[PDB]
Amino acid sequence: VETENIARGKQASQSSTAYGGAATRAVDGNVDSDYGHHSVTHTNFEDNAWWQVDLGKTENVGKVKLYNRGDGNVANRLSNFDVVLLNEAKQEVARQHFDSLNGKAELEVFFTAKDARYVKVELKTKNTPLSLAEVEVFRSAT
Ligand SMILES: [Ca+2]
Ligand code: NI
């Protein structure tokens, strides 16, 4: 995969916003996982919380890297979730489910040369907020 993080500075959005946890914080080029350092997103405590980045055009995606929240003992909120790739028409082109990060600070997700415009993280869990320190997206190596 390429080394350029193509998610950086792109339009990001999420199911709702709480505690000032703006969606753009996951694409601000700062993986700092401490919520108090203002680089981690936060939705409402809600069902099926989600976060999305629009890559702005269709890209051949090979890797999505998630950086979890690290302060406050709430890392396990990022559990039982999908990482989803959508095309320009917003149809799913790939989807991977994950149980846990197992206390790891980050998760590398590898996709098999998928042409996608949107990258989405979807919690499948009830009444839980989605918080991401960063989401980085990399093109497949040519
Ligand atoms: Ca960040
Ligand atoms: Ni501090």
Token look-up 């709480």 returns 18
Give distance in angstroms: CA of 112 to centre of ligand 1. 26
Q: What is the DSSP string of the chain?
A: --S--TTTT-EEEES---TT--GGGGGSS-----GGGT-S----S-TT-EEEEEEEEEEEEEEEEEEE--STT-GGGS-SEEEEEE-TT--EEEEEEES--TT-SEEEEEEEEEEEEEEEEEE-STT----EEEEEEEEPP-
Q: Which domain holds residue 47?
A: 1-142
> Which residues in the chain have their C atom more than 2.5 Å from the N of the next written residue, marking a break after them?
none
Beta carbons of 24 and 10 less than 8 angstroms apart: no
Beta carbons of 120 and 55 less than 8 angstroms apart: no
Ligand closest in space to the Cα of 32: 1
Give distance in angstroms: CA of 34 to centre of ligand 2. 7
Tell me the CATH number at 14. Answer: 2.60.120.260
CA distance linking residue 62 with residue 66, whole number of Å: 14
Ligand closest in space to the Cα of 28: 1
Note residues around ion ligand 1 (Cβ under 5 angstroms): 25, 28, 30, 39, 134
Q: How far is CA 47 from the centre of its chain?
A: 17
* Residue set of the binding site for Mg(2+): 37-38, 54
- List beta partners, residue 119: 53, 85
| Number of domains comprising the chain | 1
Beta carbons of 94 and 62 less than 8 angstroms apart: no
> Using what technique was this structure determined?
X-ray
Give distance in angstroms: CA of 134 to centre of ligand 1. 4
- List beta partners, residue 115: 60
Give distance in angstroms: CA of 121 to centre of ligand 2. 27
